Design a binder for these strands. Structure first.
Lengths: 48, 200, 187, 46
RNA sequence: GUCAGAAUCCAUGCUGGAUAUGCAGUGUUAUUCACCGCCUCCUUUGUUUCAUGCAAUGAUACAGGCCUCUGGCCUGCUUCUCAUCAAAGCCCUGGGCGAGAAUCUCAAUUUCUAACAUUGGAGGUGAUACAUCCAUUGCAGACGACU
RNA sequence: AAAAGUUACCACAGGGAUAACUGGCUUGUGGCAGCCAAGCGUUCAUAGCGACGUUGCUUUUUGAUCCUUCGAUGUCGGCUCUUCCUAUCAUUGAGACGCAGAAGUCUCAAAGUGUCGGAUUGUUCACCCGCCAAUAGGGAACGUGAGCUGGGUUUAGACCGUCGUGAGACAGGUUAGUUUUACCCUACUGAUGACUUGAUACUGCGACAGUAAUCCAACUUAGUACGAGAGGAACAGUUGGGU
RNA sequence: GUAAGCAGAACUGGCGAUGAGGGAUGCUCCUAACGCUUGGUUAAGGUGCCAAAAUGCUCGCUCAUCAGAUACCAUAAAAGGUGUUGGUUCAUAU
């Protein structure tokens, strides 16, 4: 998680805000690429 | 006066009638496994027994229900309770009896060993026919036991496994009893008439 | 209570019957129904001259004696199934709004639009062994046809349940769909 | 005055778990349906 | 004998799980005499709610079933295997050889089972690590704890 | 025995042998539900009702009682907070009608969710103004004072009225009058933490326990269905609002 | 007295002054009254398990979407039922 800032987008909803320009709060989340390593099998038993 | 282990098949069996036999044998010191506990039966219809299990879920410690009656959903865990219900389990001796008991809803291990049947506590014997009964595997899956269809799959898998074992054995039951008929001829004619008194 | 009781059933010509255990396969020309009777304490067994099917219970109490004739009526229905089918004609009824009904005739499913001036669409899939023809030339009619009775007559009744009025007096507003006639197709 | 007045009735002679008390707040593990607007790239003009 | 069916019920999802003194998989496992494993062989002790053949693997039905199935069987593990010939001993690849065993003087548990842990030895193969305090952090914080 | 009052300025020995609170037995009284059918209901005992009778239930009213407590269980009401009951006011799904529609009245499964803002009174009750889907009734030591408040009741000051020759009295009115202690055990809410076929590290499984969403409005559906006319719905769809 | 685990009497027996076995649990109900004990036998009451002894034998009835289950005792009624099992008495097999 980083920080959040507002953005402007055009609504596409007949609401009264159809075709109008709404400000919205928006979180930026930093996501550098996740390196795959392993792999795990899972038996289905009657316990779990 | 008793065997080392006694594995019980629990299909066809009535739940209390089984448990009361099993309880007294744990007190006499016999070590027991129960097996295929999902298939165990109860008298009354399915609706009737589920209404009785709903009266059980209504009970809880009102202060802090973390503490209070643990409502156990699995068939193996349900049978375990009614056996403990027929034991003075707060005293030390009663506790020892539960220790002997092992309950399973069939694993590895004891597919390889024989499973016995308590005949008094049995549905075809007891329940006068027409009178509606209910399987515990159905009653448990009604009340949030998730693992119905695995215990379908694993049993259906290891029944095919067992029928492969059967047809080896059934071929070499023929094969011994063929070689018996040769051996019964060749030993002298006095001792053939001796065995036909006493059955062999 | 009662020592012995036995009614017998006449098998018609173009049918065969194979009662092993309690379970009774009926094969005819049109299709075949199988049906189990492992509730009833009863000895089913057909005869030497093999167009007759006797059925008997010893020791029948007066409640359980009434399941001897319930067997016969179910097995008789299975015979006139595999010969003749079971057509159930249903007719539409309405005052103002004409009710508009379509069919995926193989599948089969019955969407029912514009029932009592409504916009909710009401699909009703039938049970596996029954179809739905829209009956031509007679105005406003659905013919339900299949081999079994209990599959057809549910599938008829499910349409009646779907198209039911609420929140209004049922005596005035007779807008619905109802079974006209039980019959067979072939005669 | 930053507190409840009455915890409990006399019986049960025990404090129930449903009554609210003082303790930890935050650091709880916790949502659903939150729309993604933009996937970006670190590799200008984001 | 079935079918539809609710702001219901049980799941699912959500919170905990030091709420089962619950259970699984995977990494690395002590600077080279220095302890430490694993697998056999054989001895010191000490645990067991309970050794004396403390034995036996289709899967179903019950107004039907099973097959060695043109026949035969069911009416109970009430059976079927196992149990010999010298010692709970000694010799030959698991079976088989022989030998005056008693005065253990009329009974005294028929002291040796089983796996589990442990003391010290033989031979075969192996291994050369981390955690806490400390300082720092502030996504955390009454102090512990946590990052 | 030869013998009047008063004490709220009071005192002492005792009493649960004996009152004023809760609890217990009882249920007349209060509250709730049945059975019979004279009539009401244009006609028709039973859609909805139900006289004259009669059978129960309840402990949310009030008595009756004196078992417990007088080397003290802190006596009203409000505020706060939780849970439980159903004899259901609303919301869900049905059934009945003297149900055309709309609006209702009656009944069944229903306690999952909800039941409000104010004026006067210490009030409990009550009665109004308004909103709302609806403003249902109750229990938990007549829930709840080491939780508060102290308006009321119930000490000592004082006033009025009635009663008393007087001191004084009043389930008559009036104003002024101290609300003590947790650091013990448990409970509840959070915090570490020894140990178990080794240590230590990471990823997990999920028995069991708790649970969460719930109501309304507008737009179209539609001035359509239904109706002699006035009036006047609903489902699917779209958009909002309350808690 | 509406009634009360309410108040007041008559006859006998208990509790109080009294344990033991049974009624799960109970001063007053049942059996039965007690010196320390070995063996035998019963009482009341019980025999699926907790729990010593019957999953004993034999003949009926009952299916409860709130079955029922042991005197005092821990509540139930009027009125109903084409649920089922028998009986009584009329009328043509019902």
């Amino acid at each position: 998680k980083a920080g959040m800032t507002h953005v402007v987008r055009e609504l596409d909803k007949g609401s009264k805000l159809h075709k109008k320009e709404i400000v919205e709060a928006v979180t930026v989340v930093d996501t550098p690429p996740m390196v795959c390593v392993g792999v795990v099998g899972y038996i289905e038993t009657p316990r779990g | 006066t008793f065997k080392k282990v006694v594995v019980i098949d629990c299909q066809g069996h009535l739940l209390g009638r089984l448990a009361s036999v099993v309880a007294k044998e744990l007190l006499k010191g016999q070590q027991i496994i129960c097996v295929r506990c999902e298939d165990i039966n109860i008298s009354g219809s399915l609706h009737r027994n589920r209404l009785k299990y709903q009266r059980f879920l209504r009970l809880r410690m009102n202060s802090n229900p973390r503490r209070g009656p643990y409502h156990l959903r699995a068939p193996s865990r349900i049978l375990w309770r009614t056996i403990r219900g027929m034991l003075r389990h707060k005293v030390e001796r009663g506790q020892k009896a539960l220790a002997r008991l092992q309950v399973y809803e069939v694993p590895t291990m004891v597919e390889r060993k024989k499973r016995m049947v308590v005949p008094s506590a049995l549905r075809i014997v007891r329940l006068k026919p027409k009178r509606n009964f209910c399987r515990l595997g159905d009653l448990s899956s009604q009340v949030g036991w998730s693992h119905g269809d695995l215990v379908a799959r694993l049993e259906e898998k290891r029944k095919t496994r067992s029928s492969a074992y059967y047809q080896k054995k059934k071929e070499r039951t023929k094969m011994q009893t063929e070689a018996k008929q040769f051996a019964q001829t060749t030993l002298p004619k006095d001792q053939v008439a001796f065995l036909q008194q006493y059955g062999h | 209570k009662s020592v012995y009781a036995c009614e017998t059933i006449t098998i018609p010509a173009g049918v065969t019957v194979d009662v092993k255990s309690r379970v009774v396969t009926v094969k005819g020309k049109y299709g075949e129904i199988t049906r189990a009777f492992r509730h009833l304490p009863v000895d089913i067994q057909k005869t030497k001259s093999g167009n007759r099917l006797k059925v008997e219970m010893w020791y029948g109490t007066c409640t359980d004696l009434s399941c001897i004739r319930t067997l016969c009526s179910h097995i008789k229905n299975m015979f006139t199934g595999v010969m003749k089918k079971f057509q159930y004609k249903m007719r539409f009824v309405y005052a103002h709004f004409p009710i508009n009904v379509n069919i995926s005739g193989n599948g089969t499913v019955v969407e029912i639009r514009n029932f009592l001036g409504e916009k909710r669409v009401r699909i009703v899939k039938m049970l596996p062994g029954v179809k739905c023809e829209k009956a031509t030339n007679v105005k406003d009619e659905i013919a339900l046809t299949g081999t079994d009775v209990e599959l057809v007559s549910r599938s008829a009744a499910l349409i009646h349940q779907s198209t039911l009025v609420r929140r209004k007096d049922i005596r005035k507003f007779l807008d619905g769909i109802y079974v006209s006639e039980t019959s067979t197709v072939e005669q | 005055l930053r507190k409840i007045a009455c915890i409990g009735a006399w019986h049960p002679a025990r404090v129930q778990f449903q009554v609210p008390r003082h303790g930890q707040k935050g650091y709880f593990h916790r949502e659903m349906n939150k729309k993604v607007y933009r996937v970006g790239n670190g590799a200008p003009r984001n």
